[PDB]
Design a protein around this ligand. Structure first.
Ligand code: OY2
Length: 295
């Protein structure tokens, strides 16, 4: 077993925790570089992860190296100074300005268009893993693997937001997710930036599914062909009627609501793609504003 390959890094503070890893702000004792370090205590993962080292995009957090040591895997990443979750909480009383919301949505759709073109899915987009900098950029981080691994961290306080961004086909037991799962997650994040409240804040898998049903209507073969034969579908689901989007995301203009409605189509095969969404009229006036960041 290897040793010593981490002596060059000085942990500065903890910045995140997940089911299978802990994330630190760290200073390379030699380089002087400040990085983010994910520590996973302990195959197909090595090839899948090392493939993420080549997916380089201005809207994807750069993965710098992958360091295997003493039955611990380290991921070394570029460091950003704030995540969208904290920025959204910092703006809860003022709201994020719409031109900045639009900029952020456009950039993340650019990021997803890139990954999806390379047949990479994120699988777990959440405000907490969208990272922002002072110059107005936002970046995707913490790509979810197809086969999770690593010893679960016993100190992991779970989070209320865990299921809030999960696409309905995942919740209904689809075995093979498509890139449409990421568009759903981003639509949920788009709505939350606009309204300052989570769109579908479910606290169990069935609560998550039912919160979606009460808002968009219980799906049937009319809007989602094949849904009634999905693994976890139950003919005994309650039958809620669809609400109108004017009530779900005020104060979003008609272009925004139109784009959002397409990001939240039940049928993954009808849900808009990242590339098509970039062409939506909502973005004809997109700009790149500066956020006001504290630290
Ligand atoms: C290499 C570490 C990594 O894989 N990830 C995904 C895990 N997290 C979330 C805590 C993360 C945060 C930051 C960051 O700059 O936070 C301010 C940078 C990278 C990562």
């Amino acid at each position: 077993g290897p040793l010593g390959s981490m002596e060059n890094f000085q942990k500065v503070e903890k910045i995140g925790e997940g089911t299978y890893g802990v994330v630190y702000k760290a200073r390379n004792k030699l380089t002087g570089e400040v990085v983010a370090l994910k520590k996973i205590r302990l195959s197909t993962a090595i090839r899948e992860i090392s493939l993420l080292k080549e997916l380089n995009h201005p809207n994807i957090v750069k993965l710098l190296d992958v360091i295997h040591t003493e039955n611990k895997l380290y991921l070394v990443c570029e460091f950003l100074h704030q995540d969208l979750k904290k920025f959204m909480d910092a703006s809860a009383l003022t709201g994020i300005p719409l031109p900045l919301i639009k900029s952020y949505l456009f950039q993340l759709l650019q990021g997803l268009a890139f990954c999806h073109s390379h047949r990479v899915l994120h699988r777990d987009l959440k405000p907490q893993n969208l990272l922002i900098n002072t110059e107005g950029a936002i970046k995707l981080a913490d790509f979810g693997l197809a086969r999770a691994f690593g010893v679960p961290v016993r100190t992991y306080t779970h989070e209320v937001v865990t299921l809030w961004y999960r696409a309905p086909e995942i919740l209904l037991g689809a075995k093979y997710y498509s890139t449409a799962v990421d568009i759903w997650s981003l639509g949920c994040i788009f709505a939350e930036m606009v309204t300052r409240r989570a769109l579908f804040p479910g606290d169990s898998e069935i609560d998550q599914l039912f919160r979606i049903f009460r808002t968009l209507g219980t799906p049937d073969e009319v809007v989602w062909p094949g849904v009634t034969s999905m693994p976890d579908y139950k003919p005994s689901f309650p039958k809620w009627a669809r609400q109108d989007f004017s009530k779900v995301v005020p104060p979003l203009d008609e272009d925004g609501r139109s784009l959002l409605s397409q990001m939240l189509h039940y049928d993954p095969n009808k849900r808009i793609s990242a590339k098509a969404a970039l062409a939506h009229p909502f973005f004809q006036d997109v700009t790149k504003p500066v956020p006001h960041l504290r630290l």
